C-alpha cells in the first residue's frame, strides 16, 4: 500500500495480525486484462472414423421404468432400501475448534 510506517505499526498492533501480507486491495498481482488468444481442445467424439452416433446415443438408451409388482397380475429374509450408513469418523485435521 502507501501508508506511513507509524500507521502500519498502529494498524498491525490494533488488529493483532500483520496486515501487509494480506491486503484487501489488489495491487498489480491480478492477471492482465488482455490475454493471449486461446486454443480450446476438442471432445472425445471429434473422430473421423469409428464414431457412429448409434453407439454413443445416451438418450436412446433410456428405458421405461421396470414394473416390479402389479396388482393386475421358503422363508424370505427382511430387506432394507440400502445397507445402513456407516458412522462418520471424527476429522483428524481439527476435531474441535
Amino acid at each position: 500500500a502507501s501508508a506511513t510506517r507509524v500507521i502500519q505499526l498502529l494498524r498491525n498492533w490494533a488488529s493483532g495480525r500483520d496486515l501487509q501480507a494480506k491486503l484487501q486491495l489488489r495491487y498489480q498481482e491480478i492477471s492482465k486484462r488482455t490475454q493471449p488468444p486461446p486454443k480450446l481442445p476438442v471432445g472425445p467424439s471429434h473422430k473421423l472414423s469409428n464414431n457412429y452416433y448409434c453407439t454413443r446415443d445416451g438418450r436412446r438408451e433410456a428405458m421405461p421404468p421396470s414394473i416390479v409388482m402389479s396388482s393386475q397380475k421358503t422363508e424370505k429374509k427382511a430387506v432394507t432400501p440400502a445397507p445402513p450408513i456407516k458412522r462418520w469418523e471424527l476429522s483428524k485435521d481439527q476435531p474441535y475448534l
Binding site: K22, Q24, L40, S45, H46, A62, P64
Partner: protein, 215 residues
C-alpha cells in the same frame, strides 16, 4: 489466499462477543427429531447435531474426490448455527484450493450436438452442426418421458427439483423444493417462549430467501 484473514476479522467481532452470545445463545433451540420431522435439512440439522450432509452421503459431480469436514452443532441454537456456517466457509475454502490444484483439461460441454450446441466455427462450416444449432435454439432437445427428483446440498439446505417430462421439448411439470419453505413453516415452532428480537434472530439464523420460498 486473501480470504482467511477476512474470516478471522469477521470472527473477531462476533464469535467471542458477549453481546452476540447473549443475542444468539439458547434462542431458537430445536431438537433433532423435531427438526427432521418438521422437515429440516442442512445447517438446521447440523446445528441440532444430526450427522447428515448430501455432499458426502449422496455425492454428485466430483464432490467425492475432495476432502472436507462437516461441522456439527451441539445445542441446536443460533450460535451453533453461526459457528457451523463459519466452519463451512473455511471448508469451502479448502475445497476451492483442492479444485484449483486438480482442475483437469478437456472440453467443457458434452460432445453430443443433439443436446449441447455445437461451436460457432463448426456451425458456420458444417451442415450437420448448422442443423443441430438451428433445432436446438428453435425447438430444443427432447427429453425422454419420465419423472425425477434430484436434490443437492445448496448453501441453505436440500434444494430439490421434481421434473416431469412427457417426451416433448418442454417440461410437463416442475416442482421446486426450497429449503427455506420448511424452515419458515417451522418458524412458529422455534419462536415459542421468546420475544420480538428473538424472532428476528431466529429468522436471520433460518436464512430465509422469499424468492425461493414463494417461487
Amino acid at each position: 489466499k486473501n480470504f482467511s484473514f477476512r474470516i478471522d476479522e469477521l470472527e473477531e467481532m462476533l464469535t467471542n462477543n458477549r453481546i452476540w452470545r447473549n443475542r444468539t445463545v439458547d434462542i431458537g433451540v430445536v431438537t433433532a427429531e423435531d427438526a427432521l420431522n418438521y422437515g429440516f435439512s442442512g445447517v438446521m440439522l447440523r446445528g441440532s447435531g444430526i450427522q447428515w450432509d448430501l455432499r458426502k452421503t449422496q455425492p454428485y459431480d466430483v464432490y467425492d474426490q475432495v476432502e472436507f469436514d462437516v461441522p456439527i452443532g451441539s445445542r441446536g441454537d443460533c450460535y451453533d448455527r453461526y459457528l457451523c456456517r463459519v466452519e463451512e466457509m473455511r471448508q469451502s475454502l479448502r475445497i476451492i484450493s483442492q479444485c484449483l490444484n486438480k482442475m483437469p483439461p478437456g472440453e467443457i460441454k458434452v460432445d453430443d450436438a443433439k443436446v449441447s450446441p455445437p461451436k460457432r466455427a463448426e456451425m458456420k462450416t458444417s451442415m450437420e452442426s448448422l442443423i443441430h444449432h438451428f433445432k436446438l435454439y428453435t425447438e430444443g432437445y427432447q427429453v425422454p418421458p419420465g419423472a425425477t427428483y434430484t436434490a443437492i446440498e445448496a448453501p441453505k439446505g436440500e434444494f430439490g427439483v421434481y421434473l416431469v417430462s412427457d417426451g416433448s421439448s418442454r417440461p410437463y411439470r416442475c416442482k421446486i423444493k426450497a429449503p427455506g419453505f420448511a424452515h419458515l413453516a417451522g418458524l412458529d415452532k422455534m419462536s415459542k417462549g421468546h420475544m420480538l428480537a428473538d424472532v428476528v434472530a431466529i429468522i436471520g439464523t433460518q436464512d430465509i430467501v422469499f424468492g425461493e420460498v414463494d417461487r
